[PDB]
């Protein structure tokens, strides 16, 4: 891995420091429209969370990756960044369970920060 | 008209209008091949989607189904607004079954998987085929 996009979600994921992020100013931003998405589209994360509640516990592994990948496809990058906002709750509940590498979703991840630049764009510019 | 083309092939599609009938049968039609096509390209997703709305599908829980349908639906693209309406799909042929259930009852839904009329139709009619 470089891109640059792609270092910045896996800090993220995986919840580095700032200074230890080599994107750091980047890392940021996605945190940013990351939380403002988590704001306006409440609703939807408590309703998503819950669906996933048994896969989440049961550590039902494929399920997870078969939800968050049905997001993704040819997403615009506002969806891209909701199911990254997702990932990162689902992670943090897999981590209190057994330690889960944010690369055990690199799939999702890859779904993700496809057409970067079109991503950083929309974190940069707009997502407010 | 405040219904365009589109929306007139998907309600009828979602309340499942015999195509004899039907003021846009050819939209109808290619709008079926289109999800008929998602559905089996994706059968795994669609799969596990099903089975972790079910709760919420027995038990009528509309709103759940509205966020959860929602979720991948404001900006979308002709592609993220054919998957969904694939699932709605499903979702509304078996609240049918439990109870009466008209595609009018997810409207928003609908207007969602709907803006952008020739960007959508584009997409079933020029693009959801790799041969």
Not at 26 to 47: G, M, P, W
Not at 78 to 106: E, P
Request: hydrophobic content about 40%; proline content about 1%; aromatic content about 8%.
């Amino acid at each position: 891995m470089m891109s640059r996009l792609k270092t910045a979600v896996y800090d993220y994921l995986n919840d580095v420091d700032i200074t230890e992020c080599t994107e750091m100013d980047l890392l940021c931003q996605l945190s940013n429209c990351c939380d403002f998405i988590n704001e306006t589209y409440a609703k939807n994360y408590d309703t998503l969370y819950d669906i996933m509640e048994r896969d989440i516990l049961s550590y039902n592994i494929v399920n997870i990756k078969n939800t968050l990948t049905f997001a993704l496809r040819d997403a615009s990058p506002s969806v891209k960044l909701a199911t990254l906002t997702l990932l990162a709750s689902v992670i943090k509940k897999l981590n209190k369970i057994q330690h889960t590498d944010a690369a055990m979703f690199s799939e999702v991840i890859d779904g993700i920060v496809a057409e970067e630049q079109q991503v950083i764009g929309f974190i940069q510019k707009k997502c407010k």
